[PDB]
Ligand binder design. Structure first.
Ligand code: CYC
Ligand code: CYC
Ligand code: CYC
Ligand code: CYC
Ligand code: CYC
Ligand code: CYC
Ligand code: CYC
Ligand code: CYC
Ligand code: CYC
Ligand code: CYC
Ligand code: CYC
Ligand code: CYC
Lengths: 162, 73, 172, 273, 118, 172, 162, 172, 172
């Protein structure tokens, strides 16, 4: 899993050399930032649910036809799934904030994203909206660096999805 | 071989080398006596300085000799 | 490799001297801007996919032939390459932007690029065009973000430009 | 050791158990001190699922400790077929290769370079691939890139021990399995001073790599056929390094990176250092 | 094999038909511990139908305790312990319990024919 | 690989849940100690060469035979190995110390080490001994530095120990 | 040349991915620290000379025999060299502080250290003393983090030399 | 490799004889069925994507846990693998079906497979299940095609089954 | 076997020396704590049945599948085993706790446990989980008893934890 701390170790390890000043500097960075990161996570964790509802919803407004019978958005099972999924995305995001690296995201969400989505015919687009809508809401509860961090990670997914 | 960009990911000054090619250096996977390529009898490569010495020594013990050396940039 | 700091060092080395106090003050101030510098980078990386997507659309609206049979962007295979390439260039540019130095960009990326394009029969002109298209879009984001402390980024903006341009030039 | 029957008279799943024997467990019927026979230093018992518990408790109550337990079904399975690797195939990238021929080499490389191990699309390296097919990079140089790539380090070198990584490397870069303790030693020393990169470089640089599939030929399994300056034991080692097809070098599995070749086996072939 | 038969059997005559060839096979091979060989015997129908049926539960317990181990039973309670097993669990377990017992293991534990150390 | 943070995540994942507030407070406090943590590492790395040198001297004063003809540290070649080994172990330990987790150490350094030693005929016991010798010296520095703000490092000191010990144990 | 900034780029580059949050965190670290680093450099740069004199000197006290005729420490040429050399070490150290990485040190000083020293029969020991003596002096002019940084680098050489 | 023809040869070889007339008549007949045989294969390949897609859906409807945190199909990464695997198995099966022989399937695919799955902690049971799910769907197509001359394919259908089953068994 | 006392002895033996006075004082103090030590053990043993019962309930509430057809805890037979196992582990842990040493636990109990679980196809993860569940409950009692003289047991509490954890780790 890719976090700041793991990487520097890795790099140090590869070269076969002790952790010198170079790496520590880097580590320090991660730790200083954490305070902001941590804050953001506490904020998302708390409002989770509400964000999720809002997102799921949005998607349907954006793509009305999904709710019609014979479509994917139709029938509760699918709706449940849709909810679940977004929860996940969120969950991971929090994780990543705390871990101080994309790592968590990469391994759970991103790697293999495409094929999953292809084989089940999930349109990336949807997820994206979810995220965007989220981003917009988050853009109220948070501010300053905490916010900035939240964004970074949220986006990172947008980019991976698209 | 014209370098599209710096070939090598690890970074140093890079130097193009042109070598006459022995059959041994690039044996084709063929029955009977191996034959080096028809088109390139002069493989041209981009090498980092660090690797330069090893590359050259391996080239030297193999039959083929440096036609020329040029800096890669 | 190289970057702003390392560079100044190297210069100093050949003179055989400690760093001049004047010279330190270049670096001292450079540090201060960091925060700005960073956000700039962040903005690019954050929007990456889009930047490209956008630029492409415009590229192909302009030079219709590229996408027509016999053109360079046709068929799929080629198209793919062309997209990938744009991205790469971008990636590098970003790198530079962080470093505070062209080098990385020049050395890893730009060097030999022209010649490649030539050998393939890719029209260098069009490539250059794309680079610019990208440039403008990118700046767009760098310069209009959300949630950032309001202030002047011009200095960085221009340096960004330059990088794009070195790219454009050496390809072209 | 081969186990003759997979299930007992009353239905049960037989399990081989291997223990380091102790004098109390087995002892000769002699005067003087009790001694377990030497040949049975390692002792393999086959027991139904039911008795396992009681069998092992007793072994551990005595000075015995359990080297490993394996299901008898997995055990007493054939040595893997060498069909595919008996004659490897061979992949040659001609200059002015067609789009398809380039694709074939890439796929072949990823196979041998990373073992069965699957490479996701995200994992796959566009830049390196890009360079091949325009010219400018040898298949040999592509190989180098791949070993240098983090993907490889994360799998092979970062998880397992450097003793593990060296044979893992031998197999990927050369068909061959390692012969002798000396090779393992040498590589470790090279890693200490030179660092990862130089060790990686040495394999590709080495003449053996040049003598077979030197340039523009993806590496293929030289092991499983007779090779110059190869100890007979190496052949047997290959069977340990290579298990079947669809069997990969996996950091993913439980205690994922371990040694396929036991150190004593290496010592058998050659010692001196 | 000769010895094993005698010690666990009554010293009763054993016909070639009586002898179980599958257990005898495998000894040459390996893959059967001699204690496990001895387990196969008595799990044999041969011993259960004859040397088990006729005699009372107490009888075979003493005779097992003799055939498998030299000792006759030191105390009433231990005889009783096996009697608890009769219904408690299947017969096969109880005989298995003897060779699995510690002292069977302690002396002539592995790779050894049992003996009337009594 | 793994470290303190990642680990806690993973646990949380399998439960399928967002992080407990309680759990955050483990990490929150862990952060606070960073500074201490870091210096600890720094101290080791700074003194590395010495730590080893020292430990060796003592190792060989104790087990004279190792250095005598027929022993395992004789001749030069072997000696070298023995030194190299010690170093490695150390290196890893350090790594762990930074991560805040044994894992890294266990996987690349410890796993299969015992068996190697066995196969070679290197006496595992002596190796273990050396590890400890190292431990004590190392702690020595961690715990008595110069120019650092004075406070309590015990927590870290003990964790350091543990790492050394996992090493000692799995080798032995 | 190995600095924080160069490395993250390198790592990013290898994977073939954009600089994401992970790396930036690291970079940030380097920049925050710099203020202390920079200070240290200004202090060494100023007192350079005096440090050099003191060191050279020390070495001779430590190893009297060097100053005897037929030895290395003997005759001005050698003394001059001895001075020069130490200057260098110092020079580089400063560099490295500023660059925020061992890089400068590695490439100038460390790489090829052994063989140079072997062929000219320079005993590492000497240099070491120089450094140590220096370290001791530096341990007055500086304080807190600035100091800590100075040490790290000074040491790094000690370790490389030995 | 091996297939129906080659096989019979090999047998004959060890006896040291020309092919028995009886044996020829196995092959002679086998030829006659070719056309049928082929179409069977064609049907699989044609529907491939679907076969899988379908089987998966059903697999996951049944064993909900596989897709839940802590299960084997979670997270995405794993899921992907699992899909890929299914496909592979299929691919091989097809091959066999053409050859008229299990071998190819056994050797390339099934060899080692169980053990792998075990080591990973992948539940062999579930894998087997999936294989069957696939089987049924596949047969579905083989047996109900469009535009093909109507006749009896049973013979082939059953052989197909067997292949699937060898798979199921050796995995399980 | 081994325990705290015996251990120290053994160490001393290899040095070839009488016990150091310092070392005695480790044991001397260890003795003093006895009474505390004992009660701790007593608490576990007293509540044993419960500890397990409890842990199980929670284990199965979490991982529903274990108890569903196709899971590992199904059917009855299996379930029984799983319960039995938990108990055993506990039993050992206790032993250790008394001894004042991991050994007994490692040697009799943990050794080979992982491999067993593997061979069976038992999911090691879940086992580990259970161990922890147990841990917490157990501590619960150790730390909150009735009729005992009030004092600090932390030292013991932590050591207890460690034992549980060694278990968790080596199984996992
Ligand atoms: C919500 C915007 C839309 C929607 C989604 C939907 N998804 C599926 C099925 C899957 N979706 C995923 C996604 C994930 N599952 C994971 O485990 C992860 C990583 C944590 C992700 C991102 C996957 C893997 C599947 C396939 C297996 C599964 O059952 O989850 C469906 C069901 C389609 C099907 O069963 O074939 C649906 C409907 N639902 C909506 O209504 C929106 C359009
Ligand atoms: C025979 C009619 C005449 C002849 C042949 C000859 N060739 C060589 C050596 C080489 N010839 C080749 C030819 C090829 N290169 C290719 O890549 C291909 C296929 C695309 C061919 C056919 C090459 C590359 C070599 C060099 C390496 C080699 O060993 O083949 C020789 C020997 C030269 C030597 O000094 O070893 C000969 C004799 N030349 C004559 O004299 C005949 C009239
Ligand atoms: C797209 C905007 C325009 C375009 C692109 C295009 N590129 C190729 C082929 C290549 N382009 C590259 C790019 C690179 N070389 C490097 O060194 C790097 C950085 C490491 C990059 C990004 C390379 C290597 C090739 C050749 C191989 C490949 O598959 O990319 C083509 C196809 C040419 C061919 O026939 O192979 C195209 C179309 N050209 C256009 O027409 C667009 C205007
Ligand atoms: C420039 C194009 C736009 C802009 C930038 C801007 N940023 C700041 C200040 C900060 N920006 C950051 C961001 C980061 N620091 C990091 O460590 C990282 C990596 C994790 C990032 C992304 C930080 C921390 C600061 C300091 C606090 C803050 O956010 O205010 C400023 C303020 C001036 C300064 O130099 O700090 C500015 C102006 N703002 C604009 O108006 C441009 C559109
Ligand atoms: C004496 C010259 C050297 C030596 C010997 C030594 N051996 C052991 C232990 C055992 N050695 C054997 C060997 C045999 N057992 C047999 O049955 C046979 C032949 C049929 C042999 C030759 C065995 C099995 C053991 C272990 C169990 C046992 O003692 O029966 C030791 C002691 C090891 C222990 O911990 O018990 C020793 C010391 N070692 C020396 O010191 C000399 C160099
Ligand atoms: C020193 C305290 C003691 C000692 C050590 C010693 N080791 C070897 C040989 C090897 N050491 C290793 C071990 C490692 N490889 C790794 O990557 C790691 C970390 C995971 C270790 C610790 C290996 C692989 C070897 C064998 C090959 C090699 O020499 O490089 C020896 C030499 C003995 C020989 O003949 O090989 C020695 C001496 N031995 C002592 O005497 C000390 C008690
Ligand atoms: C523990 C073994 C020793 C100890 C440490 C200690 N350190 C601090 C505080 C700091 N230490 C550092 C050091 C670093 N921070 C970084 O970013 C880096 C990498 C470049 C290092 C090396 C820093 C910056 C601080 C903050 C300021 C300061 O120096 O005080 C403390 C103070 C308490 C606290 O941090 O909460 C302590 C106690 N003290 C000991 O007892 C040992 C000598
Ligand atoms: C001081 C402790 C000793 C001393 C100095 C001295 N140095 C040399 C020779 C060399 N010194 C260096 C060192 C450097 N040159 C560089 O370019 C760098 C890297 C930036 C360093 C640090 C070198 C390279 C040499 C070798 C040859 C040369 O300088 O031309 C000598 C001469 C030794 C000889 O045998 O020629 C001396 C004397 N003087 C003393 O008294 C101490 C022993
Ligand atoms: C899906 C039906 C079930 C499942 C499967 C699963 N497999 C892996 C990993 C591997 N599986 C294989 C299989 C093959 N490799 C081959 O080359 C071939 C034949 C030629 C096959 C079929 C291998 C080698 C691996 C290792 C490489 C890899 O990990 O991709 C996993 C991933 C392991 C993990 O735990 O991450 C999985 C999940 N598991 C399920 O849950 C399904 C019931
Ligand atoms: C069997 C599973 C189902 C079925 C098949 C079927 N096919 C034929 C006859 C033919 N089918 C083909 C098809 C091919 N021949 C080829 O060479 C290729 C690959 C290039 C294909 C795909 C051909 C040429 C024939 C012969 C001409 C014809 O179509 O009549 C039959 C008839 C039996 C026979 O040919 O001996 C059958 C039964 N049809 C079913 O009813 C099954 C569901
Ligand atoms: C319960 C928490 C989990 C579980 C356990 C489980 N175990 C088995 C079978 C065995 N487990 C053991 C146990 C031990 N062997 C030892 O040596 C020790 C210490 C002395 C222990 C703890 C053994 C040997 C067996 C095999 C024989 C036996 O009768 O136990 C099973 C059943 C295996 C089967 O295939 O039926 C189970 C289920 N598995 C779960 O489901 C829980 C997560
Ligand atoms: C610790 C987890 C909790 C605790 C314990 C505690 N116990 C004592 C004192 C004693 N405990 C015992 C108990 C035993 N000694 C034995 O020999 C046996 C086996 C028969 C037992 C069960 C004894 C005898 C003593 C001494 C007299 C007494 O009971 O007070 C103390 C007092 C301090 C001491 O070290 O003796 C304490 C604190 N109390 C807590 O607060 C914990 C929850």
């Amino acid at each position: 899993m890719k976090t700041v701390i793991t990487e520097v170790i890795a790099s140090a390890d590869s070269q076969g050399r002790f952790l010198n000043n170079t790496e520590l500097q880097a580590a320090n960075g991660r730790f200083q930032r954490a305070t902001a990161s941590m804050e953001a996570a506490r904020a998302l964790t708390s409002n989770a649910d509400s964000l999720v509802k809002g997102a799921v919803q949005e998607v349907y407004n954006k793509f009305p036809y999904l709710t019609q019978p014979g479509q994917m958005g139709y029938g509760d099972t699918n709706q449940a799934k849709c909810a679940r999924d977004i929860s996940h995305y969120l969950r991971f995001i929090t994780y990543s904030l705390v871990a101080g690296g994309t790592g968590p995201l990469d391994d759970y969400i991103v790697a293999g994203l495409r094929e999953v989505n292809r084989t089940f015919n999930l349109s990336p687009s949807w997820y994206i909206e979810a995220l965007k809508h989220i981003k917009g809401k988050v853009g109220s509860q948070l501010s300053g660096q905490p916010l900035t961090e939240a964004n970074a990670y949220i986006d990172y997914c947008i980019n991976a999805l698209s | 071989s014209v370098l599209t960009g710096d070939n090598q990911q690890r970074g140093s000054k890079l130097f193009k080398i042109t070598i006459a090619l022995s059959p041994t250096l690039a044996h084709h996977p063929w029955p009977g006596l191996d034959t080096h390529e028809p088109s390139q009898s002069s493989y041209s490569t981009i090498v980092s300085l660090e690797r330069l010495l090893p590359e050259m020594t391996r080239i030297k013990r193999n039959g083929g000799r440096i036609l020329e050396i040029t800096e890669g940039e | 490799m190289q970057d702003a700091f390392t560079k100044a060092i190297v210069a100093a080395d050949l003179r055989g001297s400690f760093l001049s106090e004047q010279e330190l003050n270049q670096l001292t101030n450079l540090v201060k801007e960091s925060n700005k510098r960073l956000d700039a980078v962040n903005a690019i990386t954050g929007n990456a996919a889009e930047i490209i997507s956008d630029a492409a659309h415009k590229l192909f609206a302009e030079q219709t032939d590229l996408i027509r049979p016999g053109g360079n962007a046709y068929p799929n295979r080629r198209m793919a390459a062309c997209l990938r390439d744009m991205e790469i260039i971008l990636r590098y540019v970003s790198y530079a932007l962080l470093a505070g130095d062209a080098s990385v960009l020049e050395d890893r990326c730009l060097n030999g690029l022209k010649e490649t394009y030539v050998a393939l029969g890719t029209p260098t002109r069009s490539v250059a065009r794309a680079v610019q298209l990208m440039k403008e879009t990118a700046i767009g984001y760098v310069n209009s973000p959300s949630g950032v402390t309001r202030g002047d980024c011009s200095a960085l903006v221009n340096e960004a430009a330059t990088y794009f341009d070195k790219a454009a030039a050496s390809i072209a | 050791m081969n186990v003759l029957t997979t299930s007992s008279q009353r239905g049960g799943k037989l399990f081989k158990v291997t223990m380091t024997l102790s004098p109390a467990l087995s002892h000769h019927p002699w005067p003087s001190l009790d001694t377990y026979e030497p040949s049975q230093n390692s002792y393999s018992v086959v027991v139904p699922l039911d008795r396992l518990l009681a069998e092992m408790t007793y072994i551990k109550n005595k000075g015995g400790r359990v080297l490993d337990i394996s299901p008898a079904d997995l055990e007493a399975l054939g040595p893997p077929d060498i069909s595919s690797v008996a004659i490897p195939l061979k992949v040659e990238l001609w200059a002015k290769a067609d789009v398809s021929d380039v694709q074939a080499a890439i796929v072949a490389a990823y196979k041998q370079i990373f073992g069965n191990t699957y490479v996701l699309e995200s994992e796959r390296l566009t830049s390196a691939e890009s360079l091949l097919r325009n010219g400018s990079i040898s298949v040999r140089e592509f190989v180098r890139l791949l070993a240098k790539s983090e993907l490889y380090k994360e799998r092979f070198f970062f998880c397992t021990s450097n003793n593990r990584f060296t044979e893992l490397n031998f197999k990927h870069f050369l068909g061959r399995a390692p012969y002798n303790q000396s090779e393992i030693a040498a590589h470790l020393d090279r890693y200490q001073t030179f660092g990862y990169d130089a060790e990686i470089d040495s394999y590709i640089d080495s003449d053996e790599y040049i003598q077979a599939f030197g340039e523009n030929v993806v590496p293929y399994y030289r092991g499983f056929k007779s090779q110059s300056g190869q100890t007979v034991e190496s052949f047997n080692r290959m069977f340990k390094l290579y298990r079947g097809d669809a069997g990969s070098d996996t950091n993913l599995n439980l205690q994922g990176q371990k040694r396929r070749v036991d150190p004593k086996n290496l010592l058998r072939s050659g010692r001196g250092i | 094999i000769r010895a094993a038969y005698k010690q666990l059997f009554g010293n009763t005559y054993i016909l070639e038909s009586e002898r179980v060839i599958q257990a005898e096979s495998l000894l040459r091979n390996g893959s059967i511990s001699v204690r496990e060989f001895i387990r196969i015997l008595a799990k044999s129908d041969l011993y259960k139908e004859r040397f088990f049926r006729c005699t009372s539960n107490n009888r075979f317990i003493e005779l097992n305790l003799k055939h498998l181990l030299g000792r006759a039973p030191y105390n009433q309670g231990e005889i009783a312990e096996h009697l608890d097993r009769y219904c408690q669990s299947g017969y096969d377990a109880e005989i298995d319990s003897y060779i699995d017992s510690d002292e069977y293991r302690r002396v002539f534990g592995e790779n050894t024919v049992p003996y009337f150390r009594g």
